[PDB]
Design a protein around this nucleic acid. Structure first.
Lengths: 98, 83, 109, 100, 100, 83, 109, 99
DNA sequence: CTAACCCTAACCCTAACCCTAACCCTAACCCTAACCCTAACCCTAACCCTAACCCTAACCCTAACCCTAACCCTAACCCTAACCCTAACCCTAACCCTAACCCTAACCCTAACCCTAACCCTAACCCTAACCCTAACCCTAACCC
DNA sequence: GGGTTAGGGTTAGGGTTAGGGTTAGGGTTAGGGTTAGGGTTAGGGTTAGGGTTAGGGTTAGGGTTAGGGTTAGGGTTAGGGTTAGGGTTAGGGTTAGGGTTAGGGTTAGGGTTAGGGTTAGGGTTAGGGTTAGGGTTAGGGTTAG
């Protein structure tokens, strides 16, 4: 016994923080958290696969930002793509300035 | 392990409840057999993929992860059990 | 020497683990080399999507007069939002259900 | 004698409104486990299954059946008819897929 | 002299075999290229298309239209009718999963 | 060009021959507008994808490989118009 | 001495470049390490598939009374045999046309 | 003329020598050649991606003949799958006997 | 058009378990030194799109005639819907055992850089035979009589 | 009713543009070394699944009676099919231009790697709080007058 289990990881600690900013008093369940984790992992793997395919098509060897932006514009539908691009550019600009 | 009675397990009343949720008022009498047939056809492929994944994993226990990986190959993705 | 360590997330202003996102891209064999703005970009996109989904779920839960976000509320919000339904069409949420909708022809005469 | 007998259709619409709100399962678990254990006997012998596996199987099967019944109902209403017939499922396990 | 005049359906059935036996394109290239230009004018200006992209687009569009017309004919025959109606295309797109 | 007769370029005959190849004997008079609209939307989607690929490639010419990669995203692969 | 060189394809008696398949699997960034029997297996599978497709195309050309293999024969063969249409269902072949098939309801009296 | 040029790689000669074996006294066109090349590339990409996913799911970092056979069984339909498996096993055995 | 009657939406307790906090700590994210492979940038040359002028040509647009299939009203009965009474079968706990999944060592065994030629694959050239268009010659199909 | 029409193979027959065979060359695979890391065997442990017993409680099958739905039939009328006659538009030439992209030749900004060093999320308890269960109860529905 004595624990001896592969320590598993998830995004449960990060989802809870986001919920508190968007709605202050609500709460979430374990099944909903597991569904959100699967959704995040699926979006992550979709973005990664699209970026890798773009990099292999353009005969490049590094996945830089412009690649993720094109992957987002190709995957996300309408105004969600524009909003995600705007927020990503804001985050990249803040990270470059600081 | 009875062939006929294991398929006959999906009883006529149950199939009615699955059609009332979809929005069906009147149901014929020759729908249940074809529904059981389509269910068998789907389950055969799903279980084939799951058993193939289990045999490739060198194990004798089918897991929810293997079931999800088998379902994702056919197209439909399930969020909830496993992940 | 050294300095008080500042997490890369804090430097940018996000809430998702940029280090974990970078490690997953490294151990994913997607490419030979990985940049420095791609993990922050993907984390920001994921945070925006999660915030939108959680906002819709909280709205549905408040409409259902409950404090717990059940997968029913998630399913309702996803099937009500057109863009989220187009993004998640082949996705089936467990313990979700369907939208209550009856055809006009099937209605009482 | 009037036993409040409802006209054909009212009880059906009531059951529709009832089952379009709940999220529970509409299929028994023991005969479904029997079926998923019998089907797996053709591919290999002596396999053991878990609970979450058959749970996900039942969930996916119920979702697929609900979708197929919705498509069949649409095909039946398109034919100026209210009841569903086996002729509609085939034009559906076709325009879409899965081989009628 | 005045011809026997063909009964309705003969010419259609004769042209069906001719158009199913051949492999050539049925859409002119010049009116389609200008349509492609007009559609591309909205996304970005000063675009220069090659000689193979327009041909590939025309091939894909003709294949998609042939498939859609086959589905529409199937839906029309299912409705105990011969001619096709705009409701058949809408039903086909609804069952396929493209419109809704 | 920018003329308003651009969609009208697909003539009534063209659609007749396409339906004859599909397998239709009698055609109504309200199928043409629906076919033109569906064709325009299907062209708009693929052209949007191709323009996005071209802008990501930092070029001003649209090659056949971009169209092939755009069609492979929607699920309909095209064989032979490009490697 | 270096001695004579027996091409890897020859030792296995195949017709596909096993040395090129290995280089492609290395440069494709699919995994970190690649075995030795995987390129031979993939080359054998590709050779079998190509041989079956070319046999069907040659049969179609013989039935069409021609000596060349046109894409029409390939389309006919793929749309005809049981396990080829299911494998390539979403595949659209240019200059292939459609399969002749007329419904019995549209036939004359 | 200019600073060198570009050489392109294609599986033609191989398809032609397979066609000469499966049907003597038969020709082929460039359209069918490109179609066969695209088909081979598509099958290659599919079998490579499935093998990579199978290797990544089991915490392994080596694509082997077992993973390739599993990918072939998962991708190919029925009889073609078993035929390809047998023809691959034969080639692997011949290579193991003589390298 | 009310009676009579039924099935839902809506409060006032209880309580149970699943969610929300507080601990311990260990695997993992940062800084600070190297380093070099990758990407940016300018110059240039060939090409391959972009415009315009030609003809004629199979092609499309508009009109008239008229056989036809889609649409609406009516009747029959046969398939299907609502309700009750069994009793067989689904559902829940506890017990028991055992096979199977996961940690824990040691070790070959198979895989990864790296010069070095050298035979295999690709780019041009020349050729000619298989395919395509042009005219007679039946040749079999429609469909009235 | 066996014809008139009337579109479709059938065959010489000549012309031609595209597969097929032949060399010269760059280039990429295989051979013989050393080295280190992931994959296989052999154990122990521990835990979840399958097999048994026990009720007893929701519910499906089998009837009975009935009323709403389907299919066939008939009639009517627009809305497509078919054909001729004229004229804009599509398509193969030819010419000129110039914007473009695929390379070379440097060069500095950005990539990876390793070793400590500190810390934040994962693995444990506990407790108080939300909603499901079980009674009443008004109200909106429904069957039938």
């Amino acid at each position: 016994k004595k624990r001896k289990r592969s320590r598993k990881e998830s995004y449960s600690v990060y989802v809870y923080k986001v919920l508190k900013q968007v709605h202050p008093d609500t709460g979430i369940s374990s099944k909903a958290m597991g569904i959100m984790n699967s959704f995040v992992n699926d979006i992550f793997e979709r973005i990664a696969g699209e970026a890798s395919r773009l990099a292999h098509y353009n005969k490049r060897s590094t996945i830089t930002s412009r690649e993720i932006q094109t992957a987002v514009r190709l995957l996300l539908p309408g105004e969600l793509a524009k909003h995600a691009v705007s927020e990503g550019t804001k985050a990249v600009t803040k990270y470059t300035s600081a | 392990k009875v062939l006929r009675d294991n398929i006959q397990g999906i009883t006529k009343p149950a199939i009615r409840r699955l059609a009332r949720r979809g929005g069906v008022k009147r149901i014929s009498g020759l729908i249940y057999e074809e529904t059981r047939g389509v269910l068998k056809v789907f389950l055969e492929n799903v279980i084939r993929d799951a058993v193939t994944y289990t045999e490739h994993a060198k194990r004798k226990t089918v897991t929810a992860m293997d079931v999800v990986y088998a379902l994702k190959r056919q197209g439909r993705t399930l969020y909830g059990f496993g992940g | 020497a050294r300095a008080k360590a500042k997490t890369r997330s804090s430097r940018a202003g996000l809430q998702f683990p940029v280090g974990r996102v970078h490690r997953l891209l490294r151990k994913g064999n997607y490419s030979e080399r990985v940049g420095a703005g791609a993990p922050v970009y993907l984390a920001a996109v994921l945070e925006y999507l999660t915030a939108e989904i959680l906002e819709l779920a909280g709205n549905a839960a408040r409409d259902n007069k409950k404090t717990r976000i059940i997968p029913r509320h998630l399913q309702l919000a996803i099937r009500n939002d057109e863009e989220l339904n187009k993004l998640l069409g082949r996705v089936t949420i467990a313990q979700g259900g369907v939208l209550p909708n009856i055809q006009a022809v099937l209605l009482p005469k | 004698k009037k036993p409040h007998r409802y006209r054909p259709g009212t009880v059906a619409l009531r059951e529709i409104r009832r089952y379009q709100k709940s999220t529970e399962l509409l299929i028994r678990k023991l005969p479904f486990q029997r079926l998923v254990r019998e089907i797996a006997q053709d591919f290999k012998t002596d396999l053991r299954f878990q609970s979450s596996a058959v749970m996900a199987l039942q969930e996916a099967c119920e979702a697929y059946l609900v979708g197929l019944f919705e498509d069949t109902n649409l095909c039946a209403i398109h034919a100026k008819r209210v009841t569903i017939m086996p002729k509609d499922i085939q034009l559906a396990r076709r325009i879409r897929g899965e081989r009628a």
